[PDB]
Design a protein around this motif. Structure first.
Motif, PDB file in Angstrom:
ATOM      1  N   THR A 161      55.865 -13.771 -44.947  1.00  0.00           N
ATOM      2  CA  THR A 161      56.048 -12.419 -45.420  1.00  0.00           C
ATOM      3  C   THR A 161      55.095 -11.420 -44.724  1.00  0.00           C
ATOM      4  O   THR A 161      55.165 -10.226 -45.019  1.00  0.00           O
ATOM      5  N   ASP A 162      54.193 -11.913 -43.850  1.00  0.00           N
ATOM      6  CA  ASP A 162      53.124 -11.047 -43.297  1.00  0.00           C
ATOM      7  C   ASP A 162      53.755 -10.019 -42.320  1.00  0.00           C
ATOM      8  O   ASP A 162      54.750 -10.304 -41.660  1.00  0.00           O
ATOM      9  N   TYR A 163      53.127  -8.846 -42.224  1.00  0.00           N
ATOM     10  CA  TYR A 163      53.589  -7.810 -41.281  1.00  0.00           C
ATOM     11  C   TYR A 163      53.648  -8.414 -39.870  1.00  0.00           C
ATOM     12  O   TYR A 163      54.595  -8.136 -39.087  1.00  0.00           O
TER      13      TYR A 163
ATOM     14  N   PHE B  87      55.604  -2.528 -31.653  1.00  0.00           N
ATOM     15  CA  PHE B  87      55.082  -3.735 -32.285  1.00  0.00           C
ATOM     16  C   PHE B  87      54.324  -4.671 -31.315  1.00  0.00           C
ATOM     17  O   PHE B  87      53.823  -5.731 -31.710  1.00  0.00           O
TER      18      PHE B  87
ATOM     19  N   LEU C 174      56.900 -10.187 -39.107  1.00  0.00           N
ATOM     20  CA  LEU C 174      57.985  -9.222 -38.860  1.00  0.00           C
ATOM     21  C   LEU C 174      57.927  -8.601 -37.486  1.00  0.00           C
ATOM     22  O   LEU C 174      58.957  -8.453 -36.780  1.00  0.00           O
ATOM     23  N   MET C 175      56.698  -8.291 -37.042  1.00  0.00           N
ATOM     24  CA  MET C 175      56.518  -7.724 -35.727  1.00  0.00           C
ATOM     25  C   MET C 175      56.984  -8.732 -34.649  1.00  0.00           C
ATOM     26  O   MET C 175      57.723  -8.356 -33.698  1.00  0.00           O
TER      27      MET C 175
END
Length: 121
Positions: free
Chosen positions: A90-92, A26, A95-96
């Motif tokens: 909520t964006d990828y 990531f 999370l990364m």
């Protein structure tokens, strides 16, 4: 005129913490500054006044830029919080960042506990 040196804690952030983060699956969005034009990001530099990234942090560590571990920790905090301020939660990319931050915190928990300057030859 910014003073810089190597301490036990700064060395740990470089050789243990950054080592783990840099190679992580990531890490790639974070290895250079956010390119707001390339990524088509409206208002990035209006919202984010102090950009930061791991490439910048790694270079600072390599060049003995920091005076104390807290300055490096502050840079990491700015990189993660920048992502949390700008993006939808909520964006990828969020999370990364959260995953890298978690590893960051877990690795920091084994850092030497009293900051002491290292001899630099």
């Amino acid at each position: 005129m910014k003073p810089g040196r190597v301490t036990n804690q700064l060395q740990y952030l470089h050789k243990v913490v950054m080592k783990a983060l840099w190679k992580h699956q990531f890490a790639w969005p974070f290895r250079q500054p956010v390119d707001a034009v390339k990524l088509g990001l409206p208002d990035y530099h209006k919202i984010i006044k102090q950009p930061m990234d791991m490439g910048t942090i790694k270079r600072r560590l390599e060049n003995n830029y920091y005076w104390a571990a807290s300055e490096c920790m502050q840079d990491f905090n700015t990189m993660f919080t920048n992502c949390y301020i700008y993006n939808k939660p909520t964006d990828y990319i969020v999370l990364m960042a959260q995953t890298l931050e978690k590893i960051f915190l877990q690795k920091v928990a084994s850092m030497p506990q009293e900051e002491q300057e290292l001899v630099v030859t």
